[PDB]
Symmetry: D2
Subunit: 509 residues, 4 copies
């Protein structure tokens, strides 16, 4: 009954997947823990099985990765760059079949699955460039015969914990950067996207092995909260990059702080789009559509709040309503399909709980609000009006496709309402006013890590640093100088002279 044993899913073998797969890789493949079955959210059928990590597996893998680090850290960065380049090429080769696997096991539509892999490809190109550039400044010493320099060195082992909704790209951002920086990696992905984790690890393993490098440089330990907790408490994990819920993320941050580790937290969002009276509505409506119903509203960057100026409120809602009705629903791998299933059954229940609660708090469902009567975890993408900006149900990160719509009049109040939530990931305004754009980007504007103008809250490119503020956790990934989070800084002063002048002109003699 496994999908992978059915003739139409034979393409899965192009990723090297079988009926039962090893979920631990450290140079060798294994897995002595529990076997998990993952399911297609589009039809609730079992795909294939993964043998997860046991305690012994985790312990062995950590030790092997750290031993592999002794070799990898000695390889010059541009040569490490060359490995990441080849990973980039290996992804390019598999991009359609890997994207199809993401569509099958996670449930996002094919163009987004392929697009997610493209993020990994892109950050590989960026990292290759970085491998020739990373480092610090030579600074002028105030002391004669001294050099003052900033050195950057790998932290060691980077633990990477990722979530179900971007089962490839987030690992990719971390992997590519942490690698060229001289670190080894240990991946624990979402249990419900284990096959994706295995498939990606198979691609990377072959590059490492083909370059006669130890596989444990990019290690994999599939597991649940037991493995993630072990990572958060493990002093041998020098940096823990965690992407997931705010609730879990807070505890991960506390555990890592308790051992004076380093953490990179990428947590939830409650992101807002704001449409001012002068906004190009031809930009607003498709932007809101993509930001809200993209990935069935299961992105951390998904727009969950839509603020519309009172003068254009009804008109925007009407046009958004017509747009929602023209969304093509189907199997996420099927063509021209723009809307797939939610990732889990539990998610469908929450969607129901939130829609009913929204009704109870005074809100009006102007579109959707119901489960689709069809196989899979399909719900109607939903629009709710009439609620206040401070309504409890709207201050609740539900990973459901529900968009809460609010009226506003003044710029000052609506900027405040953007900022009033606990999360601080993404935000966007739609406007032409020059001054307003300046204020939005300034000290009294958005408090988020991503601050956009005339585009959705979702769909970042890799060139900038990605992450948010407040309860979103403060970590940054991907571009700009996010690489510094994966390295340790040292301020080095070298005396090349025969004298000992002291800083600040202190005479100690």
């Amino acid at each position: 009954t496994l999908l992978i044993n059915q003739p139409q899913y034979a393409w899965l073998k192009e990723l090297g997947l079988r009926e039962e797969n090893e979920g631990v890789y450290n140079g060798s493949w294994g897995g002595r823990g529990e076997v998990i079955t993952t399911y297609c959210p589009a039809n609730n059928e079992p795909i294939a099985r993964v043998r997860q990590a046991s305690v012994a597996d985790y312990e062995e893998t950590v030790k092997k990765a750290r031993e592999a680090w002794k070799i990898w850290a000695d390889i010059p960065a541009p040569k490490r760059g060359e490995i990441v380049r080849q990973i980039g090429d290996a992804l390019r080769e598999k991009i359609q079949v890997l994207g199809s696997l993401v569509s099958l096991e996670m449930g996002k539509i094919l163009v987004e699955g392929v697009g997610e892999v493209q993020e990994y490809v892109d950050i590989c190109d960026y990292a290759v460039g970085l491998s020739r550039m990373i480092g610090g400044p030579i600074l002028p010493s105030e002391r004669s015969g001294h050099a003052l320099i900033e050195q950057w060195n790998p932290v060691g082992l980077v633990g990477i914990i990722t979530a179900f909704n971007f089962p490839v790209a987030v690992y990719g951002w971390n992997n590519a950067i942490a690698m060229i920086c001289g670190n080894v990696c240990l991946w624990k992905g979402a249990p419900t996207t284990s096959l994706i984790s295995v498939a990606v690890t198979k691609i990377i393993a072959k590059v490492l092995e083909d370059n006669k490098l130890p596989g444990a440089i990019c290690s994999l330990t599939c597991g649940g909260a037991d493995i993630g907790t072990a990572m958060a408490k493990d002093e041998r994990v020098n940096l823990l990059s965690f992407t997931g819920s705010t609730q879990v993320g807070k505890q991960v941050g506390l555990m890592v702080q308790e051992r004076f580790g380093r953490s990179l937290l990428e947590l939830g969002g409650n992101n807002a789009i704001i449409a001012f009276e002068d906004a190009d509505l031809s930009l607003v409506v498709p932007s809101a559509l993509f930001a809200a119903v993209g990935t069935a509203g299961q992105r951390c960057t998904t727009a969950r709040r839509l603020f519309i100026h009172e003068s254009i409120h009804d008109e925007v809602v009407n046009r958004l309503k017509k747009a929602y009705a023209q969304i093509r629903v189907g199997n996420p791998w099927d063509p021209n399909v723009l809307y797939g299933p939610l990732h889990t059954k539990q998610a469908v229940s929450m969607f129901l709980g939130a829609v009913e609660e929204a009704k109870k708090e005074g809100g009006t469902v102007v579109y959707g609000g119901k489960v689709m009567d069809r196989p899979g975890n399909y719900v109607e993408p939903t629009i709710v009006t009439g609620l206040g900006h401070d309504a409890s149900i709207a201050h609740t990160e539900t990973f459901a496709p529900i968009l809460y719509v609010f009226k506003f009049k003044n710029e000052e109040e609506v900027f405040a309402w953007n900022n009033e939530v606990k999360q601080g990931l993404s935000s966007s305004i739609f406007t032409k006013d020059l001054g307003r754009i300046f204020r939005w980007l300034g000290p009294k504007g958005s408090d988020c890590g991503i601050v956009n103008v005339n585009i959705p809250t979702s769909g970042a490119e890799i060139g900038g640093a990605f992450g948010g503020e407040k309860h979103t956790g403060g970590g940054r990934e991907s571009g700009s100088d996010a690489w510094k989070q994966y390295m340790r800084r040292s301020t080095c002063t070298i005396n090349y002279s025969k004298d000992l002048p002291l800083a600040q002109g202190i005479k100690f003699q």
Copy 2:
């Protein structure tokens, strides 16, 4: 009985100090908390009194500072820099009396008191430069008609908690940088250096007043653990910069993380100097001396471990013993003096405890090891040989002037020994070998935040980022791009076109 009431201490009035001083400043001066009396560690005589903050004082001050921020953050960064430039000049004007107050209340020698103020003057210079430079790159977008830019904005209120041993400079690092970045500051210093905190705050308050700015931009709430804990738990403190013990700092870090705040931790060090066989011994010996006994061994950057290659161990120890015997002890304001008192009687007690335990663990005191028979908190600077690199007593952070001396044979083992401690602040090797210096500065070398060659572990200049790794806490202050810790990064994409191309070429 108060020193400030005696005529040979009348210079204290040049800093605006009196018999009883207000320890809360937020634009106005006050303090409803307990009155603390601070003592001169060189004679144990009371200097003057400071009325500390009550928790209600702190609450009012936080609110006023946040209101002031709304004004301050609207002032262009180069204009904020002009203010910091004037603080710089105001410090320059009072550098001698303020340095003398540092020597009187904290106990460090006058050249170090003055030198510490000079660090604040230096970072002011640096920050004035920064006020014209801070920002992020404009990046090329993969999308037609889009701009991709990185913006930096202030975090808001920066809480600053500092320790007794550097009562001016650490605040200064944080103040100058936080200010040009558009933040407001709230300072809680060490209770036993309250007068110094008040004196520094008076200097800054006058500059703010003269420039018609709200005083709460640089607020002061003198207090102890109750105020520090309030700051650690206060969601309105956007960034908490904490310098202090690893024990307290760990809890501070947890409290801040619990509320998803930002922290910058600057905690303890157990810093080593390593002298290889090819070392210039004429550099080794005075560097060890300065690193170990400067500030009477009370810096977080103090050399506490000295590894010496077998072949030169006895010669270096013998020369260091002769150098220690030439150290001139006395009142720290007497400018012929190189060595003053420990900051507290408690430090003396801990010193004696550590010396006794070192001996019980098999160490030999080859110099010092005893209290001095004079008023105040004086102990002999002390050298202990004979211990193994992993002796328990050498792995306890003792803020006292005891230098533990170890032998080694090979580079691999002694780099490991440098790295085996919980802290990771400063480290230094003395050698001429190129390959060794490369390895020391590389991925298999020192694991510390400060990695030096042929100089002490102490005495950084302000141009680089300052801080450590591991149990030192990971925070960075002062130079390089440390300013980024005082700001929030946003990645901003602006669509100037009439189209909506999506990232990664996705067709939706």
Copy 3:
């Protein structure tokens, strides 16, 4: 006779000036060349005299500066910064009287004279910061046991030739930055602003001598074309910074290239302001006024061309005409005066030539166009309409207050019209349109070094690099990383190992 001998002007003594002043400083004050008398352009009365350099003085000064360099380059950059900090303070103390001298000898109004000195103070503050920051990256080598670093070192002697129109600030830009970079400087200012050069050099000299530094670190050699030419041909002048006419600048650039020297050319502008239909006219009119008549139109950044969209052309010209009528003319040191004389009588003659040529090319003088009947070198600020955008006189830079006004309809053509001149210094558009601002700043927009939006062409701040493209010469001064032009880059590879791996994996064995 001499103004410095009259009690109305006794404040000149505060700058250390006398009836006859030495125009050479190299540690000693001297001058064996011809004695020049400078005149106040407001009344054509002699101010004071200056003994200029002989070529022998020049020779001696170059040699003493290069000797001073051996000491100065050994001073750590942050300590050179402390010297520049003190120069900044010395300028602050004299800012009113030095500003007044600029007004007296050069002819610009008092607020502009003081402002020019303020630029020097600002760049001193900036330079003090730079003195702790200058240097280059440590890069990762592709080779084991190798370090790859970028070093920056002083070029040695920086010759600085400045023009009459900014007799303090341009030297200041060059001086503050060259000094912290570890260079010595040799200044030849405009002969007609000799007193200003002397006054500035006296301020700097006191700081150097008080610090027991060799005075030739900031040498002065007052003189004319003969000294300037010697500097251009002298191999011992490692960098020649030239600010002046494009005609002279080309020859200077050619003389420096012929000896493989370094040059930094800051030449003429033919700067345009463009007002679109959606422009805020309350910003346009006072911006055009300042940009056109500030410094009596004697800035290289002066607006000389004003393009106005057809719909608002007549309105703007009428409103500009009204603002011109309210300009207050008189002695520039008078605190109520808004408009002073041209710097020389030759400039009056050139003004007259250009106005008559504009009429002969078909232009209409709608305001001004006449020499004023009063002592000194005053002319009416002038507005000319009706010329074609490519009229010869409009494509000519005349250093006089003449503003040529053009009509346009579409953006593509007027962007081309901005770019069609030989010069490329400054440019400005007034508009609110988002897309148009993007294009203006982009590859098909303005070709100038300074590209402004909703402000005049003139009045840069110091934080950014200052300079232009095309016939403006290509040099950059002041902010950003302009400091690199005063230093030589070395790319340095250091082998710390016992092996010799070759770049690109070449095996030569």
Copy 4:
């Protein structure tokens, strides 16, 4: 049968798309109405194939087509331009052995160097791809409320690239990869005697451009001699001219470009010294001197031409270098394990013999070599000359021949001055262990060269840093660090988002 390309053993040439007669002009179309040149193999003096060069009209049409193509190319976002350069990188990767072999055949350098040269191109492509997501400038804090101050970078337009015989692939590649991601179009004129290499490289690039539906004139080719080169130097439509070649020609190129206020990047000759101090590791000194001197048969601009050895070790080093020279394997340069090939031309052989005779005429002792080799092709013995003084005239004439001049020295100060005393300033190396000395070498009183090395040869740079020299070497930089800024124009841009007009320096007008 006479042409090598018509002989079966060289059939591999047709893998590069070469034939008996080739078109030497590419601008989207292939052509060439100019003189037909035949290039010869220097290893056997046999003709290889023919190339039809550009006429005047060809150059004229190509410049116009390139500048038309730029309108399309400059509008393509930098990261997408990077994707094109990435594909060029891949295409070179696939042809690297056969292209390297062609370099050995037509230019004469040995196979590992030919392949290594192509590897430099591949490496800079990887770097440029990274840069394509990074290039730009800082947002700076304005001193004025409601204003933004930013630095923009935009392409200059058409970049002319003139390259030399000795690096017929890599120099073009540095310029091409970087110029492309910066949004420029390029026009290449190579050495006539390496025309087939130019055509081969262009065929590889043209396929990538055409496959990507881009106008081929983006990377144009106009093979020709001095008439084409002079045209480019005088052509105002060439916005940036990058010239690699002799110093004498270079100065004339720089003068011509300055005369029209264009931009030039000059990469001219070197007279590079290695300095060995008494404490040097001689096991590094001897092979470094061997590679630096005899690699490329001494025909690099970075070739070590002067070897200074401390008096205490001079005889030992010379003796050891003699023995090393005798171990050099000579043969056909496209043969693997051959380490020494022919000079590029018969004229170079004559000039070699002349320089050797003059060296003896100046009192020099030939301790090794000095003679033509008894075999076909342009082979000479790599040569060592001792006994001369550092200022001997023959050691200050840049001969592209394998003659190493060896000097004695005693003191650090004198030998640093001797390094610096020549007119060129390209590369330099010291061999020492002394910390102070290395500090001094890299400092303001040390080497005056653009490349300043420690314990490695003068030649063999990696692409991560900027490449170029000082003084008569011309001042240009190519490849790494921020050399890309030479290919772009900087603008300092101020945007007023407010309704007010505060002026810089607080001027009230």
